Every structure is written in structure tokens, then in C-alpha cells.
Design a protein around this ligand. Structure first.
Ligand code: HEM
Ligand code: NA
Length: 250
């Protein structure tokens, strides 16, 4: 009961649904779901509960947030979606980019994540530097996901499984390569590749590897590697919370 969702007009709700359908077509047709998940996650993951700044409030449209080092390449995502956004002026960018993240998981075979409309577009981006550093470990993950975002250790491990989609690019993050052999399929392969150790053709970041040595994260890796259904359930709950940080709080 931690949420009290706002009431939106019937027209707002109709625009959400029509935009959802257009996003499902575009994201599938252009094979860009991993980029769109990263767009939604980088939009939301800047929330800091202590100041209630950041979070999924549309600020990735702002060129100054697009210029953050961690957001290299997301300008492509923003531009690819703008022709659809122009057809739905009633929608906030905040809702629109979180809807894109939800659709990205759906169209790649993942769980159906609930979506509640009504986020406001806020004028100021968060400061740069809130998002997790791929070179750091478990203490840093708990500081970012836990002390800033308010998310649980389970959420950290489940959300790291978003790396079942897509890849790193040398000109964006500077890392290069995919975590899985099927980077357009949302499944639990990420955790299986982590457990098997490194292999030719695939990438693991130090932040991925921190999940394996931590005594609280590791049992969750084990669980998700063995049980895709449990991974999908926990991923769904964690993505929902992430997509609503700072939004509709009771
Ligand atoms: C746990 C800490 C995390 C770190 C350190 C991290 C870091 C990174 C880095 C360095 C890249 C490469 C970007 C590029 O070069 O294009 C990346 C890509 C990606 N990240 Fe994360 N990430 C984390 C968590 C997450 C979460 C929570 C999600 C969503 C649930 C996510 C989804 C993705 C996806 C889908 C890609 C591929 C993007 C593409 O293929 O264009 N990651 N991440
Ligand atoms: Na995959």
C-alpha cells in the first residue's frame, strides 16, 4: 500500500494504450529493446530518496542529462521515440519513457510489468553521478540501489538480469560485448553465463561479478539461473518499483 496512484483522464489512459501499441511495433520492428530498457532504467535510477531529486520524471529529454557520461548513446533512443511522442502530446515524457521500458521487456519475451500513468515532467535533471559504476562492487551497488533508490538486495540481483538484453559499446560506455548469446531475448541467461565463468564471445563487468562473491547476492544468482519463473516474478516486482521511484508515494 506504499503507493497512491493519481487519477488521470480517460483521454490520458487512451493515449497510454495507443502509445503502448505504437511502441510495441516500433521497438520490435527496429530491434532496439535493449537500448529502450537502458533508457528507462537510466531515467529512473537517478532517484535519491534523501533529497527526492532524480527519478523517472522525463528529464532524459533534457540535453544536459543526455550529456552525462553514463547516458552516452541514449540520445539515439530519445530521437527514435520522438516521432511517436509527437503523436501523444498529452503524455508526459516521464510516463512515455517508462512505458517504453515496460514495452521493451514485453516484446523480448519478458514479464508483463504493471504500468500506472501520471508522472510529471520535472524541470531539473538530477546531478550526474548517481548511477552505478560498472567497475565497483557490492558495497557500491548497495549504496546506489539501496541507500539512494530504496531498493532491496533481491531487487539489485533481479534488476542486474536486465543485462540479458543488449551489449556494451566501446564508444558509449567503453566496454564492448554482450552478456548473452541471445541479446534480443529476455530470459535468465545472464545468470547462467555468470555462473559458468567468463567465456569467449561474451562480456562480464566487475559489477556483474560482484553478484557472485557476495554471500547475499549469490544465492539469488543461483535461484534465477535455475528458475526462470522466479526470476521473472522478482524482476517484474523490481522493475515496477524502479519505474515508480518518487512517484505516487503514500
Ligand atoms: C547493476 C549495475 C549496472 C551497471 C554497472 C550497468 C552498466 C552498464 C553498462 C556499462 C552498459 C553498456 C552501455 C553501452 O556501452 O552501450 C550497460 C548496458 C545495458 N544495461 Fe546496464 N548496468 C547496470 C544495471 C542495469 C539495470 C538495472 C538494467 C535494467 C533493468 C540494465 C540494462 C541494461 C541494458 C539492457 C543494456 C544494453 C544496452 C544496449 O544494448 O544498447 N542495466 N549497463
Ligand atoms: Na538474452
Amino acid at each position: 500500500m506504499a503507493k497512491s496512484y493519481p487519477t488521470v483522464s480517460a483521454e490520458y489512459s487512451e493515449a497510454v494504450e495507443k502509445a503502448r501499441q505504437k511502441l510495441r511495433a516500433l521497438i520490435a520492428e527496429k530491434s532496439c529493446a535493449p537500448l529502450m530498457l537502458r533508457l528507462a532504467w537510466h531515467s529512473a535510477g537517478t532517484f535519491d530518496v534523501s533529497s527526492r531529486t532524480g527519478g523517472p520524471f522525463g528529464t532524459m529529454k533534457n540535453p544536459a542529462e543526455l550529456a552525462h557520461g553514463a547516458n552516452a548513446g541514449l540520445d539515439i533512443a530519445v530521437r527514435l521515440l520522438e516521432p511517436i511522442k509527437e503523436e501523444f502530446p498529452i503524455l508526459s515524457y516521464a510516463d512515455f519513457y517508462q512505458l517504453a521500458g515496460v514495452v521493451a521487456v514485453e516484446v523480448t519475451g519478458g514479464p508483463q510489468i504493471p504500468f500506472h500513468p501520471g508522472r510529471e515532467d520535472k524541470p531539473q535533471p538530477p546531478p550526474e553521478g548517481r548511477l552505478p559504476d560498472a567497475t565497483k562492487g557490492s558495497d557500491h551497488l548497495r549504496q546506489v540501489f539501496g541507500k539512494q533508490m530504496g531498493l532491496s538486495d533481491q531487487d539489485i540481483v533481479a534488476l542486474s538480469g536486465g543485462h540479458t538484453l543488449g551489449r556494451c559499446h566501446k564508444e558509449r560506455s567503453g566496454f564492448e560485448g554482450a552478456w548473452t548469446s541471445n541479446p534480443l531475448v529476455f530470459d535468465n541467461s545472464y545468470f547462467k553465463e555468470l555462473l559458468s565463468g567468463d567465456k569467449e564471445g561474451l562480456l562480464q563487468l566487475p559489477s556483474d561479478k560482484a553478484l557472485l562473491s557476495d554471500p547475499a547476492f549469490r544465492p539469488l544468482v543461483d535461484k534465477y539461473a535455475a528458475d526462470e519463473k522466479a526470476f521473472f516474478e522478482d524482476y517484474k516486482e523490481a522493475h515496477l518499483k524502479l519505474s515508480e521511484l518518487g512517484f505516487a508515494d503514500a
